[PDB]
Amino acid sequence: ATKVKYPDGFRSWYHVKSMVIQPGHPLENPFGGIHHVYANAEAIQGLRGGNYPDGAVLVFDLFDYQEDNHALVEGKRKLIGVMERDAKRFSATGGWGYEGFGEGKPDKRLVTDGGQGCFGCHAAQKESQYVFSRLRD
Amino acid sequence: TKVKYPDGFRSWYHVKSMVIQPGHPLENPFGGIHHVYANAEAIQGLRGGNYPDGAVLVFDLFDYQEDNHALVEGKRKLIGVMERDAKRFSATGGWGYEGFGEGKPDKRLVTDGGQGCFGCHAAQKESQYVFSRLRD
Ligand code: HEC
Ligand code: HEC
Ligand SMILES: [Zn+2]
Ligand SMILES: [Zn+2]
């Protein structure tokens, strides 16, 4: 394709982890909100300490939140980030293709530079195949 | 008579999450970052059917650490469990309530047959005693 596929049905995949990024954290833009990480079956193989098969997809699902009496509550989806494994097609950015969908909508693709900008930051995790998230129990 | 420990619950569908911080009314026992998981049968009730027997919902509660204005997940504090069985759990509206300390099967937390859990969940009689709603 050259392009990353919209990950249909990502919401029924394995929930890896969540984190909250609030105002004042260095990454308030653009990663401010509650985010959840999801992984398909092939991605779990790579997360477990296996290698990542082609077809492995990880999803960053980012929500705005609202403060409600000492509770942070999920608001609207801001975007999904998608990493799709293909050693051959996405060799230019380390075997992963990078894409963002605005509000998680399939038409609102965000990345304009082949994912160089995305890769630039993930290149730090060379040791773990460009993935920050770690599996927890 | 007892709620079964929900083996494999971490591979279930993630319904939603929420953060309860110090000061919230529910701070104990429920303070922390929590995620709600549902088995296949519980998804039927969530998308608007009746909840069939065998439906299980799970409240998975982690501590968090605040680090330069990020909330990072720490250790699992407990899980809350609702298990649907109209016959066995008639006394608590057809749901069995149980708490597992640290998410370990040995550490049962409920000592009043679920009455305490049931008293608050009863506000949501209209939606079969469930607070969580499905979101996209
Ligand atoms: C640093 C300045 C980043 C840039 C630019 C991008 N991402 Fe990244 N990403 C970053 C972090 C710190 C994390 C981990 C968050 C956590 O909760 O641990 C992530 C995570 C992802 C993931 C999930 C898988 C993983 O590597 O943990 C995906 C799918 C992802 N990011 C995609 C992505 C895309 C598409 C980006 C450009 C549009 C992008 N990221 C930029 C840090 C940084
Ligand atoms: C009053 C306040 C209570 C009490 C005493 C208990 N819970 Fe229940 N609970 C409450 C709320 C407001 C929520 C919703 C959280 C959210 O929207 O993110 C929940 C949720 C659960 C869930 C998830 C399913 C659901 O949304 O109904 C479970 C499985 C659950 N709670 C279990 C549970 C158990 C076992 C309790 C006694 C040990 C218990 N709860 C008490 C509010 C309240
Ligand atoms: Zn207050
Ligand atoms: Zn803070």
Author numbering:
A (entry chain A): 2 to 138
B (entry chain B): 3 to 138
What sentences appear in the manuscript?
A widely applicable approach is the use of photocaged substrates, where the photocage is soaked into the crystal in advance and then activated using a laser pulse to provide uniform initiation of the reaction throughout the crystal. This work characterizes photocage release of nitric oxide and binding of this ligand to two heme protein systems, cytochrome c′-β and dye-decolourizing peroxidase B using a fixed target sample delivery system. In this work, we describe a thorough characterization of the application of the NO photocage N,N′-bis-(carb­oxy­methyl)-N,N′-di­nitroso-1,4-phenyl­enedi­amine (henceforth referred to as NO cage) to room-temperature microcrystals of two proteins: a gas binding cytochrome c′ (McCP-β) and a dye-decolourizing peroxidase B (DtpB). Laser parameters for photoactivation are systematically explored, and time-resolved structures over timescales ranging from 100 µs to 1.4 s using synchrotron and XFEL beamlines are described. We have demonstrated a sample and time efficient approach using fixed targets to carry out time-resolved SSX and SFX experiments with an NO photocage over the microsecond to second time regimes.
Prior to utilizing the NO cage to characterize NO binding, we sought to obtain suitable control structures including both the ground state of the proteins (ligand free) and a ‘dark’ structure where the NO cage compound had been soaked into crystals but not activated by the laser pulse. McCP-β occurs within the methano­trophic Methyl­ococcus capsulatus (Bath) together with a homologous cytochrome P460 enzyme that oxidizes hydroxyl­amine with NO as a reaction intermediate. Possible roles for McCP-β include NO buffering to mediate toxicity/stress or transport between different enzymes that interact with NO. Firstly, upon NO binding, a vacant coordination position on the distal face of the heme iron becomes occupied, resulting in unambiguous electron density changes.
